Design a protein around this nucleic acid. Structure first.
Lengths: 78, 85, 205, 76, 56
RNA sequence: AAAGAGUUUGAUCAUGGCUCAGAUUGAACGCUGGCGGCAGGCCUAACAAUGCAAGUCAGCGGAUAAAGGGAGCUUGCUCCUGGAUUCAGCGGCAGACGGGUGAGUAAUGCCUAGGAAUCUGCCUGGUAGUGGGGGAUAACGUCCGGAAACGGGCGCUAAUACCGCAUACGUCCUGAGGGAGAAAGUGGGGGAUCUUCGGACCUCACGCUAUCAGAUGAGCCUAGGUCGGAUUAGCUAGUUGGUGGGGUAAAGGCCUACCAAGGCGACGAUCCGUAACUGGUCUGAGAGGAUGAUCAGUCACACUGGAACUGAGACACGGUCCAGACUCCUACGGGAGGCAGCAGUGGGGAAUAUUGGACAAUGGGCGAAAGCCUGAUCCAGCCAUGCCGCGUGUGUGAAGAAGGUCUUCGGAUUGUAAAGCACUUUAAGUUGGGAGGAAGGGCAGUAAGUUAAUACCUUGCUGUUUUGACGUUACCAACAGAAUAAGCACCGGCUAACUUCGUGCCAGCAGCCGCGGUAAUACGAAGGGUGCAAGCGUUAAUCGGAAUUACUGGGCGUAAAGCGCGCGUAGGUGGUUCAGCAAGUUGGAUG
């Protein structure tokens, strides 16, 4: 399935995610098709929590891409 | 050496035995058309080609051969039967 | 890391004060000073360039208390920022948090302004910073946390604000013991015993 | 969409061989050198001659080592 | 099969020892290129102005 | 959004080498033992003990023969209205991904640009369907061989397993007219009827079939680029083209049969050595030079070699078969195995870690979901291996204590120091408090839009209650007492740092110049300190300085360097004018 899921950037105990659109057969840290915007669970003042770029997420949900379960519960933040 | 891989090797032989039958039955239906094209029997060319085309297609739908392999035989064999004129 | 140990034996070398002492007075009387550190420093010769380039790097580096790991990185953030790296080297050493506790005057000298920020007594903007390398920005309060106020050598250190001369790029409310780093200095507000560009001369040999 | 070469062989049935000269700059010394490509094209009407200036376009591979075709003979 | 120098002030590498060698020529000795490092077998003496040495 | 020093001479200038200061590292090794964070960790050689891929009850058959309702005996007890609930051999799907390594590969592997003759499960839109039968077989029962593991003989039985028949435009072939080919159920609910409204029937969901377009993935082709060697110059015979056939998802000498005699090569074919490639990395002022650990894209391999099967996809790392080498179990009958997964071993070596924790997060795999898996991962161990930060109380005063001295016998030397403190106690210690990594999940109410029967069931939002963190806490706050933390290399030079005491061409030093043969600033030392510091030194390697391979940017009368001279093939280069052209050149745009 083409899927939309989170990729770990960041560092140890300070996670950072990317909302990649990948193959769902690739590894979760490499070989994506695009990156629609990030997600940051340890954001504080000045740092955004999500930048989720809804014109390309609309294209890929149009093309039949699957959000995972958290990316699905982060596009319900609109 | 895990019970899941012992099961796949065991049931790929059952499918190797089964699918060898259905591939073998396709080669012989194309022999009889080719032997009737070689031996110039136009009246037995259509006797075998009307036998073979239902068997080429019925096996290509269950995936024993490919549906482009199936169309390739029917296009080439019925191109030789029109060449018997 | 800090240089520790004997601070009488420091100031003979380069020549001046360098403000590394213990109480309420001045420079150079009770430690019988007229001479040189070394194996025999009773006859001299050849006070020229390279050894004075290396006096000039090592005079600054014993005032402020850096080692050469941090100090060479201060050369990096001079040559990265635009214009006048010799003054950029000194503004970076003056925005330093244990330097500003000295320049505010809440601390006695820098090596008890280093040890006063480190024991979590200085707040910057209502917090606790205990790194004596925290570069302060133009318009930060540098206050004192309210558990170290009644310990008297904080207040007993506030009197040579008037006797060392006014610094005149901070302001400091002595009632709450809370400064305000008003702006960075430029190279007319710093003492003239140093030769700022002779550290840039000590870089490529 | 088009390369243009001089025919340097005719000797194959239905196949012609062109040389396509290009002047590339040398990557370190900067001299503009001549640099050659010897392609095989498909003349199905079997009518290009050694010395012809021809135009070839790229097609699907017609033989092993033969994947260009004849477009149009420019001059002779 | 090389010749190494023993840079102590007196050693005990007794004819089948198991030295580590390292690079570095000794300018006086013609045709040696290596030093026996001092501390995979033996170090002894006073040295006091150390490595590679012993430790009072 | 670019610095040079040292060294050929009695001195000189020049040519030229060596040596050095510099930055780096997957580093080793010598010296010590404070911390934190974030990283990184078999570069060498292979053989391996012992512990990680499996989920779905929607297919039978076992087990339970619910507690319940009884009955008989009477709360011991078996059969039951009913018979629960929960657990494994078929089957779908996954195992082709994730994870490891870099042996092979000098080229279509990789990079860059483009192409056309194709396949692609799951996913997303469409379009048309899912009608009716049949024969087996595994479990199981049984027997035989075997000590067992395990094989191999009969007899039963099921399905979404398998096979015919039926139908089919939007598919295949013929492209004339025509011929050709699918599928499977299950689950939740249901008012009217056919009856044992078991079922049919309606309707939902998950499926299944045909197909078209997409998305993803893959396969193919072309051109250019891609190490050193000519002390490798010729290589090729399906070789190179053509046609006929075959084969492939698909183009194709991919194969084949014949015709033809071509194809590649001094712009380096062939052979030989070496080597996964790239983004990058390291140096550099740039040009370049060196290199491909970590991280990422591609490739190859999975003990060594050959092969295929199954599948949408493999010629398959915890798949099959065969051959080989090796290893193991044996009751000699018969068998089994592959850490270049993770941890760990022995081994090699200068050198590189724990037989750890959890699926809590983010993936991935099956599932309708609950969930169940997962050495991916998230994390904890170990290690200065890097890098960054931090840690060892006073803006003073002779009391110039000693101990360490020389007489400069007063002086220099510890030279605006202490043992007193009014002393700030974080970092480590103990204690107390406390976030964030948590989105979701059961439930039981509600609204909604399917639906025909908004009946119901399910689905999507909603508020209620309940619940799940491996790290186990970061962080904050108290109390104890200065208490628990300094070393390493140099000191003749050019390092604008520099007495002596032993030793005397010995012992020894040294990167170069060189030192040492009786006062030693060069060797080995308490009179006493310049670095830079949880480091510090020396080995190795890499580029730099090197204008010392010079494209930027060098030389050849005498320092190295003009063939002994011609003539000439390729090549390189070419006077002048008008025109055209538009490959180099140049400008802009687009990808």
């Amino acid at each position: 399935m083409v899927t939309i899921r989170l990729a770990r950037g960041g560092s140890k105990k300070r996670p950072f995610y990317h909302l990649t659109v990948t193959n769902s057969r690739n590894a979760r840290d490499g070989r994506f098709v695009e990156r629609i915007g990030f997600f940051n669970p340890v954001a504080t003042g000045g740092e955004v929590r999500l930048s989720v770029d809804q014109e390309r997420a609309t294209y890929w949900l149009g093309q039949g891409a699957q959000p995972s379960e958290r990316v699905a519960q982060l596009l319900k933040d609109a | 050496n895990t019970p899941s891989a012992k099961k796949r090797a065991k049931q790929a032989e059952k499918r190797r035995s089964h699918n060898a039958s259905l591939r073998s039955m396709v080669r012989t239906y194309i022999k009889n058309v080719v032997k009737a094209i070689d031996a110039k029997d136009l009246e037995k060319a259509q006797a075998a080609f009307t036998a073979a085309v239902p068997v080429i297609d019925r096996m290509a739908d269950k995936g024993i051969i490919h549906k482009n392999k199936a169309a390739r035989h029917k296009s080439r064999l019925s191109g030789h039967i029109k060449a018997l004129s | 890391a800090r240089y520790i140990g004997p601070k009488c034996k420091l100031s003979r070398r380069e020549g001046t004060d360098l403000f590394l002492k213990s109480g309420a007075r001045a420079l150079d009387s009770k430690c019988k000073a007229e001479n040189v550190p070394g194996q025999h420093g009773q006859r001299r010769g050849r006070l020229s360039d390279y050894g004075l380039q290396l006096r000039e790097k090592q005079k600054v580096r014993r005032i402020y208390g850096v080692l050469e790991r941090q100090f060479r990185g201060y050369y990096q953030e001079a040559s990265r920022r635009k214009g006048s790296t010799g003054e950029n080297l000194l503004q970076l050493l003056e925005c330093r948090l244990d330097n500003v506790v000295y320049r505010m005057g809440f601390g006695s000298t820098r090596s008890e302004s280093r040890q006063l920020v480190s024991h979590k007594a200085i707040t910057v903007n209502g917090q606790t910073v205990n790194i004596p390398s925290y570069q302060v920005k133009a318009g930060d309060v540098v206050a004192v946390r309210e558990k170290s106020k009644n310990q008297l050598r904080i207040a007993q250190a506030l009197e040579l604000c008037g006797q060392r001369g006014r610094v005149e790029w901070v302001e400091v409310d002595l009632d709450k013991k809370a400064g305000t780093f008003k702006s960075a200095p430029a190279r007319s507000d710093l003492s003239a015993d140093i030769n700022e560009n002779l550290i840039v001369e000590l870089y490529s040999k | 969409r088009t390369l243009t070469g001089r025919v340097v062989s005719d000797k194959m049935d239905k196949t012609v061989t062109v040389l396509i000269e290009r002047r590339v700059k040398h990557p370190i010394y900067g001299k503009y050198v001549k640099r050659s490509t010897k392609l095989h094209a498909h003349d199905e009407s079997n009518q290009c001659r050694i010395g012809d200036l021809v135009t070839i376009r790229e097609t699907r591979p017609l033989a092993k080592t033969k994947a260009w075709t004849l477009v149009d003979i420019v001059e002779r | 099969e090389v010749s190494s120098y023993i840079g102590g002030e007196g050693h005990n590498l007794q004819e089948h020892s198991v030295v580590l060698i390292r690079g570095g020529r000794v300018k006086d000795l013609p045709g040696v290129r290596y030093h026996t490092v001092r501390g995979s077998l033996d170090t002894s003496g006073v040295k006091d102005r150390k490595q590679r040495s012993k430790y009072g």
